Ligand binder design. Structure first.
Ligand SMILES: C[C@@H]1O[C@H](OP(=O)(O)OP(=O)(O)OC[C@H]2O[C@@H](n3cnc4c(=O)[nH]c(N)nc43)[C@H](O)[C@@H]2O)[C@@H](O)[C@H](O)[C@@H]1O
Ligand SMILES: C[C@@H]1O[C@H](OP(=O)(O)OP(=O)(O)OC[C@H]2O[C@@H](n3cnc4c(=O)[nH]c(N)nc43)[C@H](O)[C@@H]2O)[C@@H](O)[C@H](O)[C@@H]1O
Lengths: 356, 356
């Protein structure tokens, strides 16, 4: 690709949060790239592994062919090898953020490589920045939500001088707007992940199966404990079950953090509802395999988990489930819901804990 | 003050940079508070002292009476004691920033108390935040530069629900826009600082005197070394000598970082130009007292510095000088220029190194 895009490129660090947060932003980055009509450089996703920061190529997890059906993309590999040499030489590498900020960890700026995963991400692809540009004065920043905003991007950063818009963090709302959720149709698991999910299913999961997502780490309970039921504002992915602006009801700590009793009761019920012959559990911590097996011991079915627990293949398995029960607050669960809603010709059944 | 402002308050951390950066932003914060018609809580200015972060009350450095002639203000002391108890109880304390960000040093947010001086600043006045609000979707953020922007602030954050807009960093452009520079008229040194400046002057500085600002730390030379004379964009305070958008000429490393020879030559010349009987030197590091004294040894005058070097009183002394020669890039020098331009009925003479 020595003939490059006359419109230029967007590259970004999915520098906020873990895989759920990253995917939730990436959907908005797709819609932003599409609107600007610049080619999107597909990110390396980030996985934290005490004390390694691991960059995972887009194409290891998801298929490029499929995402290309939404908008014009190149892989990070393509970008660094075929594109960067001729359109983005070291002296043109500027980072983009809302406003200059004070370094924590020295001239005011974006500080795109301060801290983790910020520095490792750009180090991975040999990028250092020589300057910062700011987009705060464009109405709504990267939203493209207000009149003149797209024009302003095009006016202020035209591709001739700015062939690459390089963003310190994903230029997208978090949590994602309802209007980007259907874009998850264009995220299809790689052959590797699908093979592994199918293998696990044939080896462990008598059909039909219920897949459940259990989010229960100490840090999660503590954010759930902060729910203000009177103000009732969105929290992370909560609009996935409660609708936009929470117009369907009230978010409670029972929804955010279902009790062990609530979980078992609901799992027992869902198993009965479809005549399930197995249960799959994905969790950040406690899979509750024993508690669930005791609860399902009457039905003569069992719960199964991945050993060790591969988050990406767990996501794939849950997307394949006959029935999925998720956590409505979690953006991890939200990946599953969007895939089940949008991946095929018709919605695959999904439920959430604490909601009926 | 148990009868509080129906329009509400703005409080902020001058969380970016040292005293120059802080004052340069504070001018814009004044204009922003004035435009919104909310009472401004005067900050504690921040001084870093390996390893103490020191908060200095506004009123120790500058006079409240004078700043009150620009817009409605209360001191931090007033705020915490008379205002906060009735209008801003712990459960209403929300921080305001452009957009949610990833913590470096855990839910996405403003992270208003992560790091130094961020945490110490709010700890000083016993504030913890229970929530974040974002203003990125208001066109130009805090600029008030675009149509509907002020209305949007008033619409989105009306004083009833939001009696206090508390900003993680100063809601103002950096570097400051030309249109806020005259606001420096309303920053008058406290009695303490003026007494000390007058004492030093009577004890050491035979009139008329030339005051010079010498900025020459290792970190400063290194930013100067980055000047792109072909693109010629503003750098920190450079528009103070080169006009807005650098329409008067080109910024060079000679202006940014005058050589030792350039400094002496120019000082010798300025001394001759007004028949100076002494020289005052303020510097971040090397005062060059010996080099200057050798250069002035023919004229039978000497250079004097403060021992130890009080930045605030040095600023006051330079504002009082018969002639001031500054560094055009430095926001520290810019405080002096603005004061000399605006404090009295008529401009007091100022020059910059490398420009004539
Ligand atoms: C507290 C908030 O939580 C939000 O988390 P939430 O939406 O659940 O979704 P994530 O952003 O993915 O954060 C949850 C992370 O925890 C691990 N995790 C959660 N569930 C599973 C699982 O079933 N299997 C495996 N292997 N790992 C799991 C995984 O690394 C995942 O990316 C964040 O997005 C916000 O940034 C914030 O931190
Ligand atoms: C590199 C950039 O430099 C910019 O500095 P610049 O405009 O000179 O102005 P300041 O933001 O004040 O940073 C310079 C600081 O260094 C010390 N300093 C400089 N001159 C003197 C002096 O004459 N006497 C004393 N006692 N101290 C001095 C002082 O603490 C002052 O606040 C920053 O605003 C930016 O944030 C960035 O760091």
């Amino acid at each position: 690709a020595e003939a490059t895009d006359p419109n230029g490129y967007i590259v970004f660090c999915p520098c906020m949060g873990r895989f759920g947060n990253q995917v939730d932003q990436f959907l908005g980055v797709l819609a932003f790239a599409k609107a600007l009509d610049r080619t999107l450089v597909l990110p390396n996703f980030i996985e934290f592994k005490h004390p390694e920061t691991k960059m995972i190529p887009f194409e290891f997890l998801f298929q490029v062919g499929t995402v290309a059906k939404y908008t014009r993309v190149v892989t990070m590999q393509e970008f660094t090898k075929k594109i960067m040499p001729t359109v983005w030489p070291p002296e043109k590498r500027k980072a983009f953020c809302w406003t200059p900020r004070q370094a924590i960890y020295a001239e005011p700026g974006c500080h795109s490589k301060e801290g983790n995963p910020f520095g490792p991400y750009w180090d991975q692809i040999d990028v250092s920045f020589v300057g910062d540009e700011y987009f705060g004065d464009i109405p709504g920043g990267f939203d493209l939500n207000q009149m003149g905003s797209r024009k302003k991007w095009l006016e202020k950063f035209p591709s001739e001088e700015y062939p690459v818009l390089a963003f310190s963090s994903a230029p997208a709302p978090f949590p994602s707007k309802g209007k980007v959720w259907s874009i998850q149709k264009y995220l299809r698991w790689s052959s590797r992940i699908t093979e592994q999910a199918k293998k696990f299913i044939s080896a462990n999961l008598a059909k039909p199966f219920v897949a459940v997502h259990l989010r229960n780490d100490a840090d999660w309970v503590r954010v759930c404990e902060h729910i203000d039921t009177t103000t009732n504002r969105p929290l992370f992915a909560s609009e996935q079950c409660l609708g936009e602006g929470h117009h369907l009801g009230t978010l409670t700590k029972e929804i955010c953090s279902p009790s062990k009793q609530q979980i078992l009761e609901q799992i027992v019920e869902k198993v009965g509802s479809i005549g399930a012959k197995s249960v799959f559990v994905a969790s950040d911590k406690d899979h509750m395999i024993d508690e669930i097996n005791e609860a399902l011991k009457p039905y003569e079915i069992e719960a199964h988990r991945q050993e060790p627990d591969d988050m990406y293949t767990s996501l794939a398995i849950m997307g394949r489930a006959d029935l999925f029960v998720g956590n409505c607050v979690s953006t991890f669960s939200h990946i599953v819901k969007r895939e089940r809603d949008h991946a095929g010709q018709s919605p695959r059944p999904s439920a959430f804990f604490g909601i009926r």
